[PDB]
Amino acid sequence: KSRQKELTRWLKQQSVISQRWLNISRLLGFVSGILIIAQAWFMARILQHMIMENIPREALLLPFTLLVLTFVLRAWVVWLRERVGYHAGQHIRFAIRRQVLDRLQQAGPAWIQGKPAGSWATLVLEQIDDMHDYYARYLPQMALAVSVPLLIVVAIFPSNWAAALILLGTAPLIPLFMALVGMGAADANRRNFLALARLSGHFLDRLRGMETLRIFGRGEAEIESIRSASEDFRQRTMEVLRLAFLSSGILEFFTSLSIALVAVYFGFSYLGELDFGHYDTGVTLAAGFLALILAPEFFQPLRDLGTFYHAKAQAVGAADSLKTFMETPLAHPQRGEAELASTDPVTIEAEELFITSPEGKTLAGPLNFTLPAGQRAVLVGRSGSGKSSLLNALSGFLSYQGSLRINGIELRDLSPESWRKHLSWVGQNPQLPAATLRDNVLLARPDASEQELQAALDNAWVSEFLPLLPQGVDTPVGDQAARLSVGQAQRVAVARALLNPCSLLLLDEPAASLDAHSEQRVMEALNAASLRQTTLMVTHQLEDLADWDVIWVMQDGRIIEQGRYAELSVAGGPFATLLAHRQEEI
């Protein structure tokens, strides 16, 4: 059909989460349609008494008291309707944010890594909150545009069938005109809303790359680029907005004709020119003020719906991305139920192993390695080899189509919640996720004796830089480990890995781009830590792999070499070439 209607269909399907709140909001929009009529009937009966019969105001207190009562009731319903309206939108946002975090939690960390985490917080914060005004204001109002206009003519029809036909006559003509040619451009508006967002990613791109613009002297020639890009957008948009605003104008025309025709018909009816509309009875003045007061209230729900246009347009854009997020097919690692009997070092073996990304793309080709229990193997190779894909597969973050048997038990059959307890990982980036450094280290087990926590801090060389921090061990870590440096951020990650007994330890480039002194400190901890259990380290620091008993070299996703450091150094194979390349860097 149309991308415009297949999102509105999606946006209507999410509203079921809170169909109760959207029914009180529809009901109160029907009470408010009655209180308007009671408001107008009293005002017409008040006005007729003091205009025709010349009754003094002091005699008119029963209608005035009931008129004030009706005005208070409308303000109560309006106050009620916009608090029921909020709940209609919150209980949907709260349940779609749960449908997004789950889908992101259910998907592995490798999936998350595809997009920057500042773009995942756009989907979760700024693009789910954009859908509030659609369910809190646009959906309750689109039901107020049928509740009141129908209820207005039904109230006027007893009084006068002509003034009830001037209003109702324009009831079908508007939705036709807003759909005869306006709908052709409403989707064309959704394409402009995408261009305006893409134009603000073109301004951002210029801002991000000002350093490159400066050095090449394109500072003043990329201002004309901003001008041309902002002029094409404006020119393209107003070829569309020249038609999209007819709906605003036309609706403002049928509400001007209807108030004009009501005034002219009643005006001439009083003068005797027109003698048909009434029910064969004199047209009372209050029969003309009833229709005239309600004539602008007939079109008021539709004119307030134009005010909420951007409520829909910023939710259709938000539903554009959310829908394609819950609809993209993701391959998840297979979850089994078996669990390891013992906490002894595991034995890893593979037979024609293929590691695949969430989108089915193969990351690591056929692997036939085999790692006996307690043996510290090393994964080396050029960037893009897929060495990390192997350390992520053993963690259960990636799905494989081969055989990867831990202690003979296939990794698919292993229930992760029990397998991850026999695992520890350091990784290239520390990524501490807690607030206090003391709880960053204790993330392995929440409660440990101070003997254990101190043992981790000293063994990982965290104790030597606590005084440098202001509050010491209990120092806050802040946004992305800002308070402390990367050199000693990695050292906190090591202390987190050494805190619990482990059966398999994975170390994916620990010294990578690390401070020179803190690089030696971590190596000293891990080289001593890797001896106690089956270890698998990824590194490019090839000059000190002498002690590690097995070395695998990965090229193009497949292991192409094996053996200890002593014989690979002189073998002249791929490792020697890699060793030669590393020896140059100082």
Binding site: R57, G118, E211, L213, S248, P296
Partner: protein, 573 residues
């Protein structure tokens, strides 16, 4: 409101389209009020006149008013939307250019105040908020005040006391209510930013650290406090929404106080007359339609808090002092540049050395240099001074025996072609990621360079029209370093700086680039900064230095015989 002054002064350009879109807003709102006030009178006048006064009524004049006040209500609304949207896109274009023109002179320095990933996204979202000052704040407020005054002035010819009691009520709620609901919802507005920025903190930590939480088992207990912050956040959103629902009821009560007063007080004398007759309906129906202009004024005032909040954020960055100034002189760029450094620092003082003096290396007119320094000792910060990111404080840089500060900006950019460590794709056509370097170049001159550098792959499909950057087709590290070199070749400059080429690149590509550096820039003096001892034989006058000081110096052949620190760098560790 004082912060907005630099950005109101941007309205002087396009001050007719902006004011026309406020004039049409008033005219639409007065035809809306006039049509219902004239209709209310016409029914009351004709009914009081009755059948007898048909011939003495002169209905022809109102029929011209009804036609007049209904054409301007429709055309006024259609053109108040077009003009105020056209005017909104011009000011957005003028804010984008002004923000870019101010941030440009301080691009490398000053702008490094925090993680630029977030800084540059809250400047894009702040220019878009300064773009709402016209339609979302200024237009509903200025439009409502003129409509209040025009009604009060025009409605005072009948009864002065009745006009000022309606205008007075409307003028109080224009001036007393928006500043009073803003004050009531200022405390929750604070509690709503402290939680929204705390949910993004906990979410980003929970998403990024998702590998470190599933392994250690805390992915479900660090999502519970995440879900706990959303609940407090949503509750604070309910209170703020429980306040907008109050300004929507009070507006419906004030608009009801005015109707009641006009029914009551105009029941007595309207002006001199003691029984007004048709004049009662004229006042009442004017109080009914008048408060349509006051609908957006409340919400148009809390959105003034957001716009002012963003008018200090932009004024914080744009109105910063650049550290570099350029003489406004015209000079010719030479074809032979002999860079000469004297007593200029190579690295910011680290580990409180307090003794690092400036190096004094000299570069011949056409001889390649290779500064080889230890990695992790300190930042290189040598290309910054040559490209004048900030004027050096230690000594003087002399470029072709003329001070570099004495060189014009357009000429300095033409005498130095630098390839940085961080290459940038401008999310445009591959043609325009190379027209960057040379503004005027035949489209074939590019394509020969691409193969000439080794980029025939990019020419395999849709060559020079392919989308790069964020729109797709991100280039790999080896693919990317070749693009930066491609730019420098087009931007023919006598002196070529290379911040750190062949970094993070494999041996097959490393030997590919280094040879490409050798013949290609034979005539063009280079100054290559690196920490890799690869292919330096083709270079001459190698500058090996550690901890901010020169230890030795000479040709690669000379160093090996010298048996200095460079020799130690060559054999073992």
């Amino acid at each position: 409101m004082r912060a907005l002054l630099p950005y109101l002064a941007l309205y002087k350009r396009h001050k007719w389209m902006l004011s026309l879109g406020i004039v049409l807003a008033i005219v639409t709102l007065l035809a809306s009020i006039g049509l219902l006030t004239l209709s209310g009178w016409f029914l009351s006048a004709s009914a009081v006149a009755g059948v007898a006064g048909l011939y003495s009524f002169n209905y022809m004049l109102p029929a011209a008013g009804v036609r007049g006040a209904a054409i301007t209500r429709t055309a006024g609304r259609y053109f108040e939307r077009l003009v105020s949207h056209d005017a909104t896109f011009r000011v957005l274009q003028h804010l984008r250019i002004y923000t870019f023109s101010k941030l440009l002179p301080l691009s490398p320095a000053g702008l490094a105040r925090y993680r630029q990933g977030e800084l540059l996204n809250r400047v894009v979202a702040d220019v878009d908020t300064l773009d709402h000052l016209y339609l979302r704040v200024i237009s509903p407020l200025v439009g409502a005040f003129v409509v209040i005054m025009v009604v009060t002035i025009g409605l005072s010819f009948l009864d002065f006391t009745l006009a000022f009691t309606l205008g007075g009520i409307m003028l109080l709620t224009l001036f007393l209510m928006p500043p009073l609901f803003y004050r009531a919802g200022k405390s929750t507005g604070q509690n709503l930013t402290h939680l929204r920025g705390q949910y993004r903190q906990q979410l980003t930590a929970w998403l990024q650290g998702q590998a470190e939480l599933t392994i250690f088992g805390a992915s479900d207990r660090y999502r519970t406090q995440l879900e706990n912050t959303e609940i407090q956040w949503l509750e604070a959103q309910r209170r703020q929404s429980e306040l907008t629902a109050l300004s929507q009821a009070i507006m419906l009560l004030i608009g009801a106080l005015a109707v009641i007063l006009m029914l009551w007080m105009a029941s007595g004398g309207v002006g001199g007359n003691a029984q007004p007759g048709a004049l009662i309906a004229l006042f009442v129906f004017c109080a009914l339609a008048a408060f349509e202009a006051l609908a957006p004024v409340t919400g148009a005032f809390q959105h003034l808090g957001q716009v002012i909040a963003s008018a200090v954020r932009i004024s914080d960055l744009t109105d910063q002092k650049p550290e570099v100034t350029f003489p406004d002189t015209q000079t010719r760029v030479a074809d032979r540049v002999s860079l000469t450094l004297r007593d200029v620092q190579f690295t910011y003082p680290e580990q409180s050395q307090q003794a690092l003096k400036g190096i004094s290396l000299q570069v011949n007119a056409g001889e390649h240099i290779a500064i080889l320094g230890r990695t992790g000792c300190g930042k290189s910060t040598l290309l910054q001074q040559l490209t004048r990111a900030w004027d050096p404080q230690q000594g003087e840089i002399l470029l072709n025996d003329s001070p570099i500060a004495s060189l014009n900006e357009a000429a300095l950019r033409q005498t130095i072609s630098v390839v940085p460590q961080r290459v940038h794709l401008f999310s445009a056509t591959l043609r325009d990621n190379l027209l960057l370097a040379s503004p005027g170049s035949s489209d074939e001159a590019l394509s020969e360079i691409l193969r000439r550098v080794g980029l025939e792959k990019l020419l395999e499909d849709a060559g020079l029209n392919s989308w790069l950057g964020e729109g797709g087709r991100q280039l790999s590290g080896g693919e990317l370093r070749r693009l930066a070199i491609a730019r420098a070749l087009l931007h023919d400059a006598p002196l070529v700086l290379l911040d750190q080429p062949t970094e993070g690149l494999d041996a097959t590509t490393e030997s590919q680039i280094l040879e490409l550096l050798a013949e290609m820039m034979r005539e063009k003096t280079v100054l290559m900064v690196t920490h890799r001892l690869r292919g330096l034989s083709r270079f001459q006058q190698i500058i090996v230095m550690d901890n901010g000081q020169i230890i030795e110096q000479g040709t690669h052949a000379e160093l090996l015989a010298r048996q200095g620190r460079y020799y130690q760098f060559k054999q073992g560790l």
